[PDB]
Amino acid sequence: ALKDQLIVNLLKEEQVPQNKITVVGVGAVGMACAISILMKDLADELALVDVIEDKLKGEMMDLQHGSLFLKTPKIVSSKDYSVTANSKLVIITAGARQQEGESRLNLVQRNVNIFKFIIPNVVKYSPQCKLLIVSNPVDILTYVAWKISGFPKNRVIGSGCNLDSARFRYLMGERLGVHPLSCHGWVLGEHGDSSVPVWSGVNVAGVSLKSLNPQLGTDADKEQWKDVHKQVVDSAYEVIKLKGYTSWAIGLSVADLAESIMKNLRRVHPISTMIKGLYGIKEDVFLSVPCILGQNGISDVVKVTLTPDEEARLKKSADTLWGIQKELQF
Amino acid sequence: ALKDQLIVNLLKEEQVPQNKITVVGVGAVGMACAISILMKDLADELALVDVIEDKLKGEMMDLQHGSLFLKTPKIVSSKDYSVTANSKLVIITAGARQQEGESRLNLVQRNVNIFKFIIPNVVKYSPQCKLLIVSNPVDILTYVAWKISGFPKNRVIGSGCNLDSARFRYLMGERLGVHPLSCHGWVLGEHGDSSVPVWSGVNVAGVSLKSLNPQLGTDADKEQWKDVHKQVVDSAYEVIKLKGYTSWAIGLSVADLAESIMKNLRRVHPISTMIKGLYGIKEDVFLSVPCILGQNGISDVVKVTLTPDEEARLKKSADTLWGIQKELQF
Amino acid sequence: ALKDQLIVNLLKEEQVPQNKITVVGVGAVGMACAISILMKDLADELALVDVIEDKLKGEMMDLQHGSLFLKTPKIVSSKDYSVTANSKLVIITAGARQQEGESRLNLVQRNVNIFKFIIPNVVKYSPQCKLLIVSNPVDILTYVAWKISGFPKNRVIGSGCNLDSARFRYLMGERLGVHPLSCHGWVLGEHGDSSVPVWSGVNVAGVSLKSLNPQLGTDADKEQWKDVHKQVVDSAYEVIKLKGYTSWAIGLSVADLAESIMKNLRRVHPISTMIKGLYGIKEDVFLSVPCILGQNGISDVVKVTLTPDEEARLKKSADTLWGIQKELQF
Amino acid sequence: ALKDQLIVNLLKEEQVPQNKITVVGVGAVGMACAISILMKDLADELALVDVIEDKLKGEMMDLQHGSLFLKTPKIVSSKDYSVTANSKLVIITAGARQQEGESRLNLVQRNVNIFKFIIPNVVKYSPQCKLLIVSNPVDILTYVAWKISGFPKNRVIGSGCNLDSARFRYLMGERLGVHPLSCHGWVLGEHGDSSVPVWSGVNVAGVSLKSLNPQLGTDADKEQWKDVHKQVVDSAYEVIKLKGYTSWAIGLSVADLAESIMKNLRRVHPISTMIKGLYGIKEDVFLSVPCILGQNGISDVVKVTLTPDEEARLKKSADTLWGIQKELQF
């Protein structure tokens, strides 16, 4: 053989991948996550899983053809979950998506049914994984993935409001003529219609915008900053109306979270987690609050100081989500 | 105003972008080129152009929303070519695509018609840009864009065989158990069924595979390495059949060329250029040969020593292209 | 020639660089600025300048030998300023450095004299550049460089407190178990002994540390957070005592500024700029305040709401600098 | 505590890093390896070891201070090897370095004595690590480290000719006006005076320079390409004569090797390995040959087909190293 005439093997020792990531679902969101992760050099192996065999194989092949231009030496795929073995991170992007004028909360029964099959199959092969839930409704589905997997809460994370806050900072950046990296502002609660803009923490270089304009984000606001949060809520629906779905911003948001987990950065992200005990919330509600994210998932929660109004709205977001949780049959 | 209570403006000046890239066409190919260019931090401004307004705006907004995760501070879009003013590089991804089982050569007239409108509009707003042609049949469309633009040949580049070569190195690497970066092999001529594998130059660490296997790539080869090239040829068809189209591999291949251009790397890439005078070729045929690629586009061409068999194959590829090319009127 | 047998030249176009950066001074600081800039791929051309012929050539050569691992195709050096022609960014690291126990302010006469020679020569060859002053005392030398150059104030930037702030954030991060990227805090004023910690602005996810601990930064503070600032002020001296000089942190700080400038990011950095007209300062004092940094240098200043105490501290920093500055002759 | 008012901890756990790198020795080379590894985002933990306590603490602090601009969340140091625990890769840059005009082989006994202390300590704390030997004479010290460690040969690697080859490629690139990435040349054998240029493998885009110029690298060669190899051999001497030592190029070469290891790349590098069984070498000689490098270190070796003269030159290099490997007492 040519290979043996060219190369002498000196070590047969087959090995386990050290930094493996799995993406479940090869729809537009799943593939945006995949390409983003590959372009950030986060994994030594990427596995893709779906139920549509041809689409799955075609997606994997297309990525494989780009290997010369990447630094992820192994890209694999299968409808079989054995292909996901030894993953450090499992990203769940499977399920029904909302039509225009349909709530993400309306996806609940359909996506819980899909999760009942995916979750156990996924956890089985990767004892060291963190579960990163992207599928909607993300908050409810992070709670669902937590209850089905039986994982500790630190290991089960929802992409939640990382994208909402990225949109909030883009929009604030645009109004102020400043890069989003230097515009700070938090959108917490549901990754949906009940999200909460934390006006009290909106700042540039530590300067509170609300200290400058105390009416910031109210109906009394001369510059109607509330319209920025309105634009954040309406973002998915405006883009869906235009191109039929969304994929790039979410793929980059998910890759941002994968980077913190894979590199143990311990950076703070507004992501879906269990908030029972915080803000007088006594139920097992999952929703976005600032979390410290690293190699063991969420190791810590940032206790944001909310004004009674921001706190009322966060509790309103938690009540909405709890009501929806009351519909779950396991 | 809040902005004025927060920020003291010291310079109101609206300066020209210095590293601008335009992508014409927001189909799956154009969007893969856009995402890859953004992940590679190649541009300070990205412009998108298409004819379908909602789609175009939606793609732009989706990319805009991921700004927090990027280093490209301005992403714009319009059907109007004024949006492309002062681009350093304009990437053409517009046009008809082949069906599964249809030659790229069969798109010629449809894409020539579209190029008759696109090219003068690009030239009007960026008369000093480098034109990178991706639309199929790439080799013929590069010639057509060169004829329409009136640009010198160095500034009209076709993505050509950059991808065929990346696929060849991926397959070679998978057979040898070596990363494609360390597997060298060139696929030249038409980015199509008449491409030419240069078996004489196929190597690992400067070790000629042909010196180890004199029948390498021939019908008489025991290991049938010619099948690797057949897999390169069938790549697009295979992927179109499974997923419906191709995008990721071409998007990374285009980002690779954009990088050599934007960064003046002077790396060698197998890309579409005029080959009149080489290998006894008399006509204005454009096809892939190893080119030195930098800030002024194609400055030089590497003279590959071809065997009588490889030469004959390239001459036939040149022959197939001119047969279509000669008939054209625009 | 072998080059002509291998390569056919198609274009004899001289080529002018598009993203050229010059580093004046090949001392530990200049070289740490160079390697960081090179590893962030910010330039297509790097030029080095010094007065020690041998040191200059050796450093230039050592960088050149790493070319295969870099994306900067041209590395050049000379004692002649013609080597720096057409730079977009010129980083000044030439000058005397302070001993242990000596103030950066004591370097003023030696460094003003050196700048009288350097600044006109840089300005002669790069009329479009941004001048980035690193040499000490940075705040006074920025003013000196601005007065000599004839450049508008937006294009004369001091590295200032970008380092002091990175140090503050690292220590804050270490205390909190959070990445410095998520620990916000600002050190303004002189890059020196009179720098000002803006406790009122110190926060994690928008949560004011001073709201949780009102005693923050005072002698009354049980956790002695004032010590974080004392460690920031003592940093250079502590590191000089241990290693003989500082280089890695300043090099990364400078490369951070180079990235916002070269890439037109419009990020907010605490860098040296004219403060006349803010905080009741009546003289042409240059010190660090949060600035929007882009392709035209400093376009805007963020007006920080300082507590009376923090403002008095800032005004004392300004007084300290003017004391030195008013005694200058050039 | 302010930390606890701000943060709620979910999980008080053992933070064993997953991608840990140790650099032993904080001289100019060790620090160039450290900066290059940090700027390539290869590790989640960097540990520095040295015998000079103040110099070590100063270097650690200086890097730590640049943390905000990095993605390596923990940088530590100690003279005690407990700090190196659970390293994936341990880089040895400790020992005497050569003076102007002193041979690397002259450092042999001083460094062997140092390796008798270092190697058992590294092994005690990271028994499963890959050992990357940089200290000179690297070929000999890789054999020394292998014998002392008792590690299998795949996990004991010498930086070897990776730098000699990058230099050769830079010089060839400069001569041809092509980026070093597209210029292929291999320098094998000792990283020093007896290194071997493989003229038969020198090429651009699979085009052999020797087929174009049959006298390439010989005395008869009109263009004197043998002078390119002489410059590779003289490089460290020329740079030591100019700047006092070398650092940038080796640091970048070492980070390149660290990248193949950490990311399981399976790239081919000319590195120090046991060559017993090749080219008529019957003894335990370590020297550079092309090696497939990944997560298990060197798993395979490319059998380079050398000319009778190139083979003779390699046997000569092997004879030189074995003669001295016999000068060893440990």
Ligand SMILES: Cc1nc2ccc(NC(=O)CCNC(=O)NCCOc3ccc(CC(C(=O)O)C(=O)O)cc3)cc2s1
């Ligand atoms: C083996 C199996 N086991 C189960 C178990 C349960 C279910 N259950 C359901 O099927 C749930 C009901 N389904 C919906 O109502 N879906 C709403 C439509 O939403 C979408 C979602 C994604 C795209 C992809 C799209 C893009 O990503 O852009 C593209 O790429 O084409 C398009 C439309 C099915 C199976 S199949």
Ligand SMILES: Cc1nc2ccc(NC(=O)CCNC(=O)NCCOc3ccc(CC(C(=O)O)C(=O)O)cc3)cc2s1
């Ligand atoms: C038994 C079974 N096993 C499997 C295995 C795989 C699959 N495969 C798929 O179903 C793939 C196709 N479907 C999807 O990709 N759906 C996920 C969409 O998730 C999101 C999440 C967030 C956004 C962001 C957006 C918004 O929040 O709306 C905004 O804010 O912009 C958009 C869409 C099906 C099955 S069935």
Ligand SMILES: Cc1nc2ccc(NC(=O)CCNC(=O)NCCOc3ccc(CC(C(=O)O)C(=O)O)cc3)cc2s1
């Ligand atoms: C304002 C205008 N001026 C003109 C002038 C001329 C023409 N020219 C023609 O249309 C002539 C007919 N062309 C073909 O025969 N097309 C073959 C099918 O090729 C494709 C190509 C792309 C996709 C898009 C793809 C993606 O977005 O990735 C997806 O999924 O839809 C789908 C099918 C159109 C216009 S519109």
Ligand SMILES: Cc1nc2ccc(NC(=O)CCNC(=O)NCCOc3ccc(CC(C(=O)O)C(=O)O)cc3)cc2s1
């Ligand atoms: C007057 C007018 N102005 C405009 C302006 C914009 C648009 N917009 C579009 O046309 C967008 C939709 N169309 C496309 O995206 N088509 C481009 C397809 O190009 C490629 C190239 C290479 C590959 C790689 C592949 C292969 O080579 O097959 C392999 O090898 O894997 C695949 C597809 C239409 C008009 S009409």
Ligand SMILES: Cc1nc2ccc(NC(=O)CCNC(=O)NCCOc3ccc(CC(C(=O)O)C(=O)O)cc3)cc2s1
């Ligand atoms: C053609 C010319 N025209 C002029 C005109 C004026 C002046 N003026 C002065 O010379 C000013 C007087 N100098 C001092 O008092 N120096 C105090 C200590 O400064 C340092 C600085 C750096 C290092 C580290 C550095 C290294 O070791 O060199 C490294 O490699 O990192 C060590 C000590 C010189 C020239 S030369």
Ligand SMILES: Cc1nc2ccc(NC(=O)CCNC(=O)NCCOc3ccc(CC(C(=O)O)C(=O)O)cc3)cc2s1
């Ligand atoms: C007529 C002439 N033309 C030339 C041309 C070139 C040269 N060449 C040199 O002078 C090179 C050697 N000199 C230096 O490198 N000195 C500048 C050091 O600048 C800094 C800046 C910041 C820090 C950060 C640090 C701190 O602030 O102390 C902290 O906080 O950690 C440390 C040191 C001399 C001449 S003379």
Ligand SMILES: Cc1nc2ccc(NC(=O)CCNC(=O)NCCOc3ccc(CC(C(=O)O)C(=O)O)cc3)cc2s1
């Ligand atoms: C018991 C003990 N434990 C310890 C622990 C730590 C330390 N610490 C140090 O010894 C640090 C200071 N010493 C060094 O840094 N020396 C190593 C230099 O290594 C190289 C390697 C390659 C090149 C490349 C170059 C060339 O090959 O020359 C070219 O080709 O450009 C240059 C220099 C001492 C002891 S003693």
